[PDB]
From a paper:
[name] is a member of the Kre2/Mnt1 family of glycosyltransferases. [name], as the other members of the Kre2/Mnt1 family, is a type II membrane protein with a short N-terminal cytosolic tail and a large lumenal catalytic domain of 40 kDa, which is separated from the membrane by a stalk domain of 11 kDa. [name], with its large central β-sheet, belongs to the GT-A fold class of glycosyltransferases. We used GDP-mannose as the sugar donor, and tested mannose, α-1,2-mannobiose and methyl-α-mannoside as potential acceptors; in the case of both donor and acceptor this was based on suggestions from sequence identity. Our results, shown in Fig 4, confirm that [name] is an active mannosyltransferase enzyme.
X-ray diffraction data for the apo structure was collected to 2.2 Å resolution and indexed in the space group P212121 with the unit cell dimensions a = 60.2 Å, b = 102.4 Å, c = 156.9 Å, α = β = γ = 90°. The Matthews' coefficient suggested the presence of two molecules per asymmetric unit (corresponding to a solvent content of 51%). The apo structure of [name] contains no metals in the active site, but density corresponding to three metal ions was observed on the surface of monomer B. These metal ions, modelled as calcium in the deposited structure are grouped close together and are coordinated by the sidechains of Asp-77 and Asp-81, Asp-308 and Glu-311, and His-84 and Glu-311, respectively. They are involved in the formation of crystal contacts and are not near the active site; it is therefore likely that they are merely a result of crystal packing. In our structure, although the extreme N-terminus is not visible, part of the stalk domain, corresponding to helices α1 and α2, is clearly defined in the electron density. These helices protrude from the N-terminal subdomain of the protein and fold over the surface of the C-terminal subdomain, which has the effect of making the protein appear more like a large single domain structure. Three disulfide bonds are present in the C-terminal subdomain of the protein, between residues Cys-269 – Cys-427, Cys-345 – Cys-447 and Cys-417 – Cys-431; these likely provide significant additional stability to the subdomain. The complex structure shows that only slight changes occur in the [name] structure upon ligand binding; the monomer structures of [name] in the presence and absence of GDP and Mn2+ can be superimposed with a maximum RMSD of 0.37 Å over 386 Cα atoms (chain B of the apo structure superimposed on chain A of the complex structure).
Author numbering: 71 to 223, 231 to 464
Amino acid sequence: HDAEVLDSIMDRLHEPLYEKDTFDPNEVLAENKQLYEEFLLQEISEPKVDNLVRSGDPLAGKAKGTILSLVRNSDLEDIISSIQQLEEEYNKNFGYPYTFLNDEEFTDEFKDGIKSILPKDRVVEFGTIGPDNWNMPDSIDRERYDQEMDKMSEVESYHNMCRFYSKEFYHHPLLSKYKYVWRLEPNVNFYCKINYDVFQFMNKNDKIYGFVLNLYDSPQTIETLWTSTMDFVEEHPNYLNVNGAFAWLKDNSQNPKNYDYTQGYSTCHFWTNFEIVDLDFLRSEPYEKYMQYLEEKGGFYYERWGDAPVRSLALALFADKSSIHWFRDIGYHHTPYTNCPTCPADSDRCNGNCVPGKFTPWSDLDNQNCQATWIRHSMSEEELEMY
Ligand SMILES: [Ca+2]
Ligand SMILES: [Ca+2]
Ligand SMILES: [Ca+2]
């Protein structure tokens, strides 16, 4: 980068978005609820773009994409619930395959249970994760881990999962053939019909990532993630994209404590239990190098670094934010949050099982919402008018 542009990014990354003590977080919270509400109460239906691929168009079903679920055998019924909703609101008209991964061996009953609730011609693949692509690596000092996890109270397997979903899933052999994943978790809800091919929408409009919910994280899980990340970026300034979502990373105005705790990160992240992702990005040098650097720091184990903030940092820093799409139209819930859009009055696109704009039923969690920051600072001119 031109030194001036780069310098100006570095400056922004080293200072809070709003000067300390020039704002009251409670007023910021209210303003932000209001901004969120304006978007959520707007009547929308689908992206206002040219190229949407309908069900049965020649391009429908032709993206190299899969729906991906990381599961244990005991998740069978919960993942079935999610699958049925996904099929009902979207995939019954497009027929993308499912890929299931598990750190243990899948049982035949899991597999048959899955197959029994999908159409006969729906393609499903089940893959085990090699122990060496899951387990705590040798580079981690286990007693140091045990010590840190003693204080922090945890399941080792949760740490493995976070790491796996940060840096390994996209290397799984079953995924080598795909460019796109729609990540699906157990026990979620979808509320609204999607009548265009989501992957083709991504490809045709150059979106590398899609999300529905955007949240604050727990700062104690990621104590040195941001500081380490800052040092990484200073060693690889060429990985920065000039239109990174830098303000979103630096917004200290709603939860200034989260910012102080991390010494510079809002903790805002895409809530990755839902994600649509272009794997070219995760396979690209900046993302792979960042993952190797976090692997070397050990924070996946010495701290509790979630795949969400990790993914989000990399997306914010190494890509143009205008390529990150907020799927406002995908009504979605995973406890305790819901993205529930508003339809025109005559529309049956949404099934009526979510209350439009009701982010969570527990108003104490309202300040975990980071969507307003995303709207205010990260949405490109195109994204702002896209619905
Ligand atoms: Ca400067
Ligand atoms: Ca620095
Ligand atoms: Ca430094």
